[PDB]
């Protein structure tokens, strides 16, 4: 189905596979995506159900002190029964999100995002050359970190760049 | 030890590389100028 | 300057004639000029032309259209890189 | 074929009017040149079939590129649209 | 004055290496500035010479083959 | 293999004869390929004759002089050819890559 979706994208890519002139086709596409999601959820849930039916001989546990987090989560998994489906859905949706993201490192490298920005670099260069405090104040105690430490406001360009960086971090 | 000898040889080789690249770039510039003024 | 290195055009092995000529040469007419003031004036004129109207136009264009082929979405990256390279100066 | 008939091709590229079919013919010629006459195309394919023939190929390609640049500089103005509309406006 | 400037810069770097208010600048500063500048200049000159001579040799070979096919 | 002073000569002759045009079909009947093959054959023959790998031997020199396309040499060696049609086809083979019906009658005359 993924191969067929890629082929259909390569086909309809010459007549705008989106925009506004794409109603019933987009509906069929989203229905097929939901069908694939339901199939994957069914597969995962029934695999977990078969595993639980096979390991049903190990049940009725208790919390034991002086142990490690691995043994703690193991005994919690053996005791509780809803944590099974909870972590199953969690891992399934995490894998779905990872597959939808793909390779974001190359996208970030092409977008070129870092800590220091052009506005901050120009402000530092101007303050090192002359004494013109343009935009927000940027004091430097032998290192451009005093405003970041004191939680001082910055420029609009730096603010929007940080907003985009945090949006990318949230997407990751 | 052959380490210090190799390091000195590499330094001399880099110096010769620079001194030869300078004159080679000058010669290429002169040759291209002559070709442009002749053609 | 070491910043003006390399001359490969494209992913393939392509070459170009010369790079920087301190004297008057016809290759300087094909490449950049021999004066930094010309590049500075070009960058200043580009930054002056890249006003709020053109920025809003490009934003509306990128919002109403998002490519049509397969080449990875780089619209915002190109926009920000062009803005930075137009507002920065060359050394 | 374009190199063999480069006389009439270049003549058509250099002769332009304010009619209707002339612009379409120039557009088709420019598209054919851009699709089947490129230095990258020459470097990719046919690179091992007489470089002298390939030399004439890239020479005609450069001539076609100069003609295309001239046509772009001529038709790149917004007022050219209304200037040419009055030449073919039958009614 | 460049020698005194480099000596003062080296002294300031050696003094601020133990200070926590110069770590970013110390990391941004090159380890071997003279060697790095020499390497950058050598690489730039080599790339320029290579590109120029390769383009010229390609043009010369194309003209050679053209004249050969025209004469024979 | 027989004559000791002709191994490289016959090798060069065989390498030159490989450029003969046997009616190529790259999609349809095209004369450009035939003309290019004939020009390449003539250029290779001239290059060999100027270098010397096809010289310094009376037999191969006479062979090359015949293949170049002459008239008095063929009139002298008429014992090989047949009659006027053989002379005409020999001329058309050793002088031009291909001919048109507008000039075929002129060449035959």
**DSSP character string of F56-76:** S-HHHHHHHHHHHH-SHHHHH
Q: Show residues of chain C in contact with A13, CB under 8 Å.
A: 68-70
Q: What is the DSSP string of chain A?
A: -HHHHHHHHHHHGGG-SSSSS-SHHHHHHHHHHHHHHHHHHHHHHHHHHHHHHHSTTS------SS--HHHHHHHHHHH-SHHHHHHHHHHHHHHHHHHHH--HHHHHHHH---SS-HHHHHHHHHHHHS----SS----SSSTTHHHHHT----HHHHHHHHHHHHHHHH-
Residues in chain F, overall count? 109
Element (H, E) at D54: helix D51-75
Mutate to test the interface with E, among A142, A144, A145 (most CBs of E within 10 A): A142
Distance, in Å, from the CA atom of F95 to the CA atom of E69, rounded to the nearest integer, reads 19
F37 neighbors F73 (Cβ within 8 angstroms): no
Cα angle at D47 between D44 and D50, to 5 degrees? 165
Q: Is C19 exposed, middle or buried (0-12, 13-18, 19+ CB in 10 A)?
A: buried
Q: Kindly list the residues from chain D whose CB atom is less than 8 angstroms away from the CB atom of residue C10.
A: 40
After which residues does chain A break, using C–N > 2.5 Å?
none
Rounded to whole angstroms, how far apart are CA atoms A45 and B35?
A: 77
Is A143 an interface residue toward E (CB < 8 Å)?
Answer: yes
Largest CA distance in chain D: 55
In whole angstroms, give the CA distance from residue B34 to residue B30. Answer: 6
- Smallest Cβ–Cβ distance between C16 and the set E41, E43, E51 belongs to E51
Query: Smallest CA–CA separation between F2 and chain E, in Å?
Result: 34
Tell me which chain D residue has its CA closest to the CA of residue C13: D43
Tokens read off for F83: 């009659």
Torsion of CA F47, F52, F56, F59, to 10 degrees: -30
Find the chain C residues whose C-beta atoms sit closer than 8 A to any C-beta of D.
Answer: 10, 12, 14
Which residue in the set A16, A112, A118 is minimally distant from C68, CB to CB?
A16
Backbone angles phi, psi at E56, to 5 degrees: -65, -40
- Segments in F2-109 forming alpha helices (H): 7-17, 31-51, 58-69, 72-76, 84-95, 101-108
| CB nearest to C2's CB, from E40, E51, E52 | E40
- Substitution target in D3, D55, D59 with the highest count of E β-carbons within 10 Å is D55
Distance, CA of D56 to CA of F23 (rounded, Å): 26
Q: How many CB pairs under 8 A join B and E?
A: 20
- C partners (3+ CB pairs within 8 A) are A, B, D, E
Residue of C5, C8, C16 with shortest CB distance to E44: C5
Are B36 and C18 a contacting pair at CB < 8 A?
Answer: no
Cα separations (Å) of B2 from B13, C35, C46, D49, E47? 16, 49, 58, 52, 32
Contacts of D3 (CB under 8 A, 6+ apart): D56, D57, D60
Q: How far is C8 from chain D (nearest CA, A)?
A: 13
Query: What determination technique applies here?
Result: cryo-EM
At B21, give phi and psi (nearest 5°): -65, -35
Measured between beta carbons, the chain A residues lying within 8 angstroms of E22 are: 142-143
Which residues on F lie below 8 Å from E72 (Cβ)? 42-43, 46-47
Chains C and E touch (3+ CB pairs under 8 A): yes
Chains within contact range of chain A (3+ C-beta pairs < 8 Å): C, E
A141 contacts E25? CB cut-off 8 A = no
Q: Which of A127, F40, A145 is nearest to E72 (CA)?
A: F40
Q: Do chains F and C touch (3 or more CB pairs under 8 A)?
A: no
> Would you tell me how many other CB atoms lie within 10 Å of the CB of residue D29?
19
Place of tokens 């849930």: A45
Token digits of residue B39: 């053609």
- At how many Å resolution was this determined? 8.7
Cβ neighbourhood burial of B16 (10 Å; 0-12, 13-18, 19+): exposed
- Among candidates E34, C2, E30, which has minimal Cα distance to B14? E34
Q: Tell me the chain E residues in contact with residue B25 when contact means C-beta distances shorter than 8 Å.
A: 45, 48-49
Give the total residue count for chain D: 91
Nearest CA-CA distance, residue B15 and chain C, Å: 18
Contact A16 C70 (CB under 8 A): no
Alpha-carbon span C63 to A54, nearest angstrom: 53
- What spatial distance separates the first Cα and last Cα of chain F, rounded to whole Å? 43
């Amino acid at each position: 189905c993924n191969t067929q979706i890629t082929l259909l994208k390569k086909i309809v890519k010459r007549v705008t596979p989106g925009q506004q002139k794409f109603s019933k086709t987009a509906s069929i596409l989203w229905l097929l995506q939901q069908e694939m999601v339901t199939w994957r959820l069914i597969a995962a849930l029934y695999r977990d159900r078969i595993q639980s039916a096979l390991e049903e001989e190990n049940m009725f546990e208790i919390a034991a002190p002086n142990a490690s987090e691995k043994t703690i989560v193991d005994k919690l998994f053996q005791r509780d029964t809803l944590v099974r489906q909870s972590q199953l859905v969690v891992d399934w949706l995490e894998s779905i999100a990872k597959d939808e993201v793909g390779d974001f490192s190359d996208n970030i490298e092409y977008y070129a995002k870092s800590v220091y920005w052009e506005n901050t670099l120009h402000t530092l260069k101007q303050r090192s050359m002359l004494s013109l405090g343009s935009s927000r104040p940027l004091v430097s105690e032998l290192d451009p970190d005093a405003p970041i430490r004191q939680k001082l406001p910055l420029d609009d360009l730096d603010r929007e760049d940080d907003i985009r960086l945090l949006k990318y971090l949230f997407t990751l | 030890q052959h380490a210090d000898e190799e390091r000195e040889k590499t330094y001399k080789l880099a110096e010769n590389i620079d001194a030869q690249l300078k004159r080679m770039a000058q010669d290429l510039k002169e040759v291209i100028e002559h070709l442009n003024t002749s053609a | 300057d070491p910043v003006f290195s390399n001359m490969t055009f494209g992913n393939r092995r392509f070459q170009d004639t010369f790079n920087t000529d301190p004297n008057m040469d016809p290759r300087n007419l094909r490449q950049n000029k021999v004066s930094q003031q010309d590049v500075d004036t070009l960058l200043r004129e580009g930054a002056n032309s890249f006003g709020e109207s053109l920025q809003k136009r490009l934003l509306d264009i990128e919002s109403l259209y998002c490519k049509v082929r397969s080449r990875h979405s780089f619209i915002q990256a190109l926009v920000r890189r062009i803005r930075g390279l137009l507002r920065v100066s060359r050394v | 074929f374009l190199v063999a008939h480069s006389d009439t091709i270049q003549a058509i590229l250099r002769s332009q009017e304010g009619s209707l079919g002339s612009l379409q013919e120039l557009a088709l010629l420019t598209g054919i040149i851009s699709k089947a006459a490129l230095p990258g195309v020459l470097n990719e394919l046919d690179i091992g079939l007489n470089d002298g023939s390939m030399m004439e190929l890239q020479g005609h390609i450069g001539r076609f590129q100069r003609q295309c640049l001239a046509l772009l500089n001529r038709f790149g103005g917004s007022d050219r649209l209304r200037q040419l509309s009055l030449q073919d406006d039958s009614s | 004055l460049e020698g005194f400037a480099s000596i003062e810069d080296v002294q300031q770097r050696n003094k601020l290496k133990q200070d926590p208010k110069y770590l970013q600048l110390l990391y941004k500063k090159p380890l071997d500035p003279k060697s790095e500048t020499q390497m950058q200049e050598i690489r730039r000159l080599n790339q320029y010479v290579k590109n120029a001579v390769q383009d010229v040799n390609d043009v010369l070979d194309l003209e050679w083959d053209q004249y050969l096919e025209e004469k024979q | 293999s027989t004559s000791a002073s002709a191994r490289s000569m016959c090798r060069v002759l065989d390498d030159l004869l490989k450029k003969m045009p046997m009616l190529h079909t790259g999609g349809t009947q095209t004369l450009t390929e035939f003309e290019l093959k004939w020009q390449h054959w003539r250029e290779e023959c001239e290059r060999h004759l100027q270098n010397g790998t096809f010289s310094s031997n009376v037999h191969m020199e006479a062979v090359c002089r015949v293949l170049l396309g002459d008239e008095e040499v063929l009139l002298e060696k008429r014992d090989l050819m047949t009659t006027w049609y053989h002379f005409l086809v020999s001329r058309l083979l050793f002088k031009h890559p291909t001919v048109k019906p507008t000039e075929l009658h002129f060449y035959a005359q």
